Amino acid sequence: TRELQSLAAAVVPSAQTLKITDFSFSDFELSDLETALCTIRMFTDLNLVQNFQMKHEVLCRWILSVKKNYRKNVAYHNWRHAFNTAQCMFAALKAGKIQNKLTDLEILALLIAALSHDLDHPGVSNQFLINTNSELALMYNDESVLEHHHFDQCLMILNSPGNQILSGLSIEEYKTTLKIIKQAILATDLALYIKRRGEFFELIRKNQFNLEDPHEKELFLAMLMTACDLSAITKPWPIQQRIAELVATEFFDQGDRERKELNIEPTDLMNREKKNKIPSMQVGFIDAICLQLYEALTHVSEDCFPLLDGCRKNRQKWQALAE
Ligand SMILES: COc1ncc(-n2nc(C)c3cc(C(=O)NS(C)(=O)=O)ccc32)cc1Cl
Ligand SMILES: [Zn+2]
Ligand SMILES: [Zn+2]
């Protein structure tokens, strides 16, 4: 309470005013309340609120519950990263012109998934959970451990009294939507991105890519989730640099845990003593993970180009530091 009364009583500013259609968006200057207002605006301007009969108070409560169930002191995987992922999703749908390629249920599921995809993230990786004998890893057979947990949390909030933003869906629409949400959240496991992207890139290369094919549509949604999840890498340099510091802080904190709990020397990525490797690793990551993805997305919709453009600009800046 208190936070809900403040949020529910507010007039929600326009998308124009909130700057949320911009791929270059920064959350840094916004209060928590302002991010929640932006989130309501995203639901509203994607025609989800009236379409699916969402009650204002219920949507507000759900947003606040999602926000609360991030761990505030985890450096990167906290509410601001989920919010930014959702904002990139909104921008890709609007400015990037992806909206008209998708169904209403797909849009509904994508926005929910974007906001929910790292719920209760502990600030350590899947491999760390496996290595420290996490019950979650045992439960989920070492496969996309965190992402199954994020999905479980997503479900828990969606079912929580007063938070049921999907309660207005018909039985069939609800079934369809939950399935898309599950696949969307699981897709944010970078291991699954690496596993499946080859198929996506090949379909595009061979002029075989067809969004009307249900399997290819699912594949595309998975790739779009990754593109949004990684979108800090596309931001104007000062924004990207600030977020890269958070990513490093989280990784180095894991490395500290690995030294203590596993008695191992962390890999460079997670080793604060070797923070000098950051620029070269950023370049390597952009090349190995990011560029092909943003290239593929731009092929699907040319209006997604600014994501690719921003990624290329950051590559240049990191490479200048590395060399
Ligand atoms: C500023 O935005 C970002 N900055 C860094 C990452 N990020 N995420 C992961 C996982 C990751 C792994 C590497 C790496 O080098 N991995 S490696 C070859 O195994 O050493 C490097 C950067 C990474 C993601 C974003 Cl969105
Ligand atoms: Zn994740
Ligand atoms: Zn994420």
229 is in an annotated binding site: yes
* Three-class DSSP labels, the chain: CCHHHHHHHCCCCCHHHHCCCCCCCCCCCCCHHHHHHHHHHHHHHCCCCCCCCCCHHHHHHHHHHHHHCCCCCCCCCCHHHHHHHHHHHHHHHCCCCCHHHCCHHHHHHHHHHHHHCCCCCCCCCHHHHHHCCCHHHHHCCCCCHHHHHHHHHHHHHHCCCCCCCCCCCCHHHHHHHHHHHHHHHHHCCHHHHHHHHHHHHHHHHCCCCCCCCHHHHHHHHHHHHHHHHCHHHHCCHHHHHHHHHHHHHHHHHHHHHHHHHHCCCCCHHHCHHHHHHHHHHHHHHHHHHHHHHHHHHHHHCHHHHHHHHHHHHHHHHHHHHHC
- Phi, psi dihedral angles at 21 (to 5 degrees): -80, -10
Give residues with Cβ within 8 angstroms of 163, minimum separation 6: 58, 61, 62, 65, 157
Integer Cα distance of 279 and 288 in angstroms: 14
- Residue 160: CA count within 13 A, CB half-sphere: 17
Q: In the block, which residue shows the tokens 């593929």?
A: 296
Angle, vertex CA 217, rays to CA 286 and CA 41, nearest 5: 75
Q: Domains of the chain: which residue ranges?
A: 1-323
What the block records as the tokens of 193 is: 């991105």
Q: For residues 224 and 297, is the Cβ–Cβ distance under 8 A?
A: yes
d(CA 290, CA 304): 14
Residues 6+ apart with CB under 8 A from 228: 85, 86, 88, 89, 92, 114
247 lines ligand 1 (CB under 6 A): yes
Structure tokens, 221: 């949604």
Q: Rounded distance, CA 263 to CA 256, Å? A: 10
Closest of 128, 134, 120 to residue 71, by C-alpha = 120
The residue whose CA has the least distance to atom 11 of ligand 1 is 285
Tokens 């090949």, located at residue: 202
216 contacts: CB under 8 Å, gap ≥ 6: 203, 209, 210
Instruction: Give first-to-last CA distance, the chain, whole Å.
Output: 52
**CB < 8 Å & 24+ apart, contacts of 37-44:** 37/7, 37/10, 37/12, 37/13, 38/83, 38/87, 39/63, 39/83, 39/86, 39/115, 40/7, 40/12, 41/12, 41/13, 41/14, 41/15, 42/15, 42/86, 42/87, 42/90, 42/111, 43/111, 44/12
How many CB atoms are closer than 10 A to CB 175?
11
Nearest ligand for residue 83 CA:
3
Ligand 1 pocket check for 234: Cβ under 6 Å: no
Neighbours of 262 (CB within 10 A): 12
Identify the sign of the CA torsion 260, 264, 265, 266: negative
Ligand 1 in reach of 198 Cβ (< 6 A): no
Ligand 1 contact via 290 beta carbon (within 6 Å): no
**List of residues 6+ apart from 187 with CB closer than 8 A:** 193, 221, 222, 223, 225, 226
Count of alpha carbons within 13 angstroms of residue 130, beta-carbon side: 9
Residue pair 55/75 in contact by the 8 Å Cβ criterion: no
Ramachandran class of 123: left when φ > 0, alpha when ψ lies in -120 to 50, beta otherwise: left
CA 271 to chain centre: 25
- Closest ligand, as measured to the CA of 233: 1
CA-wise closest residue to 235 among 26, 79, 35: 26
Q: Give distance in angstroms: CA of 140 to centre of ligand 1.
A: 24
CATH of domain 1-323: 1.10.1300.10
Q: How far is the CA of 115 from the centre of ligand 1 (A)?
A: 21
319: left (phi over 0), alpha (psi -120 to 50) or beta: alpha
What are the C-alpha distances in Å from 36 to residues 23, 60, 80?
A: 18, 8, 11
CA triple 292-282-85, angle to 5 deg? 65
The alpha carbon of 204 is separated from its chain's Cα centroid by a whole number of angstroms, namely: 24
Q: Which two tokens stand for residue 233?
A: 């890498």
